[PDB]
Write a protein that binds this ligand. Structure first.
Ligand SMILES: C[C@@H]1O[C@H](O)[C@H](O)[C@H](O)[C@H]1O
Ligand SMILES: C[C@@H]1O[C@H](O)[C@H](O)[C@H](O)[C@H]1O
Ligand code: NA
Ligand code: NA
Ligand code: NA
Ligand code: NA
Ligand code: NA
Ligand code: NA
Ligand code: NA
Ligand code: NA
Ligand code: NA
Ligand code: NA
Ligand code: NA
Ligand code: NA
Lengths: 340, 340
């Protein structure tokens, strides 16, 4: 499994980017822009405490309250949430279970968060809010299968959640809601290939799921729905390059997809759709630096891509689509990924 | 009340703009881009039938299904919906009541559509889905007050719905959910001023509501929350000009607000934030043409603003942020606004 993303990042409901990572104390720490603009100063690192043994995953509730999901030292799923939009935090609370992957988090069309994680049986399990942005949570429920990567989840343009994960054959597999807001899940389906990273999945400007992963030759590959929220899927297509981290995907303000990954020389590289969301892909270009994690990309309140990656000093570094000079957010981050 | 918008417009879940207007037969007709790109050809006008006596208002359910709300010849609220995302339509169904305004439509954080309309008592009434993107609908319920414009609704950055309407003193009044997804509504509050148009309301890139309306001198005015999802509100500020239609507001792909209105010479004019979502406003610039409605603006799948307005031939005309030459979508539209 290619070197993981080290932070979970979100553009908050007041347009300030907030980043969540794991400190050398295995606590979750966060850092937020002081202002909703490219090149803003930062609050600096503030601890949410806890003791995590996964990548922490933040998600924005449909009422704007941030909620962080992470595996605990007891291998249960834990969460912590803002008690008001962009204000103070709850205490950590256990959602129980015994999980063996990073959590994958998405919200249903009814505002109920759904959390996916590998179980001790290596099956895909999930648990969900029983009310919009609210407990109590459901029972843990199995979607079966046997998976060998962290899962990734995205909503279809018709409101059906869809989960992607590597199988025991190293192929990309996926499973989906057959109706929004439901525990009517499909059978597992193979999209084939051989992937050597977690998959990442995004929704296109024309309402199709598209999945990115590293292949056996360490090139970036992608595959997509050929119709909105539906099969058949394309063949795998190479975006070439040689990448030494998981790829991170993000949509530009104009709908153009862009992918970030570490190269052989440990520099940050990127590749993007040109002209429009239906235009031809660029060639790889370097953004220099020396990074010791996969990059994480998010669009800021100015419509500019922002990229975060750990540096050789274990600080989190930032670069944005001006591109800007590399800037340090300081801190000391560890890779707590549950699957490496 | 300044000349109304003549169409309801939405960027659908597969990135194609769809427009809804009223034909000379008082039926609702729609027209959709063939492709998710600026300057796309159009399907041409297709009837949803019905007999409406308001502006029709389309809203996208959280599962991607379009739903149109309009007053019927019996003065009840009627609706019609897609049975699948971007596919076929239901039959018209009555939601009952007796309404005296255009409907104002928004979705709660739990995916339940809320529809607001003036009653025969000139109070603000509302009715809502009792389940995410689903009937059955609630009882009609009064929020009291006495209003003299069509209502406008927007969600706060903390998930609380907020409704704006002109009062008997010609001031801008507003009322809000004190909690998301609830019938706990606040008291009416006056934002003062004297408005001679329906208000339009939008959410800023930094999570604040901002309201635009024509003033007694026919200048464009605006007022805003000074903090995310909260008071106090700013003073009214003039954006000047002399406008002969309701203003239409839209957010650029980069968060910059932009307003469209008809000028004294019946040309389309616009004014925009420069530099960023926190930058200084431009001066008014003409986009020429001769329009016989207020304009309606929406962002397309290429991140470009698209504007629609009725022409002197009663066709719907289109111009986009290339700016492009004016292009006719043909058809023959009427202003069915319930308040003129
Ligand atoms: C604006 C343009 O956008 C591309 O997607 C890429 O990030 C380029 O480096 C940038 O200059
Ligand atoms: C790109 C730029 O955006 C502005 O908001 C305005 O629409 C201008 O006319 C356009 O040229
Ligand atoms: Na990262
Ligand atoms: Na937020
Ligand atoms: Na920055
Ligand atoms: Na939620
Ligand atoms: Na759903
Ligand atoms: Na920002
Ligand atoms: Na219009
Ligand atoms: Na749609
Ligand atoms: Na167009
Ligand atoms: Na809905
Ligand atoms: Na709500
Ligand atoms: Na479009």
């Amino acid at each position: 499994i290619a070197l993981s993303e080290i932070v979970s990042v979100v553009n908050t409901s007041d347009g300030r980017i907030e980043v969540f990572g794991v400190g050398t104390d295995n606590a979750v720490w966060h850092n937020r822009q002081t202002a909703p603009h490219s090149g803003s100063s930062w609050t600096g690192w503030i601890s949410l405490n806890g003791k995590v043994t996964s990548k922490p995953v933040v998600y924005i509730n449909t009422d704007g309250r941030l909620e962080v999901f992470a595996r605990g030292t007891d291998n249960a799923l834990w969460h912590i949430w803002q008690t008001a939009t962009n204000a103070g935090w709850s205490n950590w609370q256990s959602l129980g279970g015994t999980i063996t992957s990073n959590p994958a988090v998405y919200v249903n069309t009814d505002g109920r968060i759904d959390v996916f994680a590998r179980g001790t049986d290596n099956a895909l399990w999930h648990i969900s809010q029983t009310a919009a942005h609210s407990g109590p949570w459901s029972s843990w429920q199995s979607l079966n299968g046997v998976i060998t990567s962290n899962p990734a989840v995205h909503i279809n343009s018709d409101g059906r959640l869809e989960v992607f994960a590597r199988g025991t054959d190293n192929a990309l597999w996926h499973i989906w809601q057959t109706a929004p807001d439901s525990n009517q899940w499909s059978g597992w389906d193979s999209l084939g290939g051989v992937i050597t990273s977690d998959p990442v999945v995004i929704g296109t400007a024309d309402g199709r799921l598209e999945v990115f992963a590293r292949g056996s030759n360490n090139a970036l590959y992608h595959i997509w729905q050929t119709v909105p929220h539906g099969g058949p899927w394309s063949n795998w297509a190479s975006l070439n390059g040689v990448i030494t981290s998981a790829p991170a995907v993000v949509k530009n303000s104009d709908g153009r997809l862009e992918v970030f990954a570490r190269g052989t020389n440990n520099a940050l590289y990127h590749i993007w759709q040109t002209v429009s969301h239906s235009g031809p892909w660029s060639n790889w270009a370097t953004l220099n630096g020396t990074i010791t994690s996969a990059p994480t990309a998010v669009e800021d309140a100015d419509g500019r891509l922002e990229v975060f990656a750990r540096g050789t000093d274990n600080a989190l570094w930032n670069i944005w689509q001006a591109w800007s000079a590399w800037v340090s957010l300081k801190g000391s981050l560890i890779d707590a990924s549950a699957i490496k």
